[PDB]
Design a protein around this ligand. Sequence first.
Ligand SMILES: [Cu+2]
Length: 108
Amino acid sequence: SDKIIHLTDDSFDTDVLKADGAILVDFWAEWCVWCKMIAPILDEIADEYQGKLTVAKLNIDQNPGTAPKYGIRGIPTLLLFKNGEVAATKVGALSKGQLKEFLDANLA
Ligand SMILES: [Cu+2]
């Protein structure tokens, strides 16, 4: 978790929208089992994509206003931002091999 960024509705603008470089955001919740299952995968990817990517999480339970703006229908949902615009999205849990493929298809 040392390579993951914790966002708040507040910090969203700065840390994601104004952010320079690719930002992968994990919209999740407390009592979502699938959310808990990808947490470790998110750790590894983070470590492997340092310099190229910033991995960040958003607990919609404690940050209820961001999701809606993005059409978030269910969790976990992963949003890949670029230059303040969402570049790609993935709904639901996936493996590390999957997450990798998904980024690679988007990483410049
Ligand atoms: Cu860590």
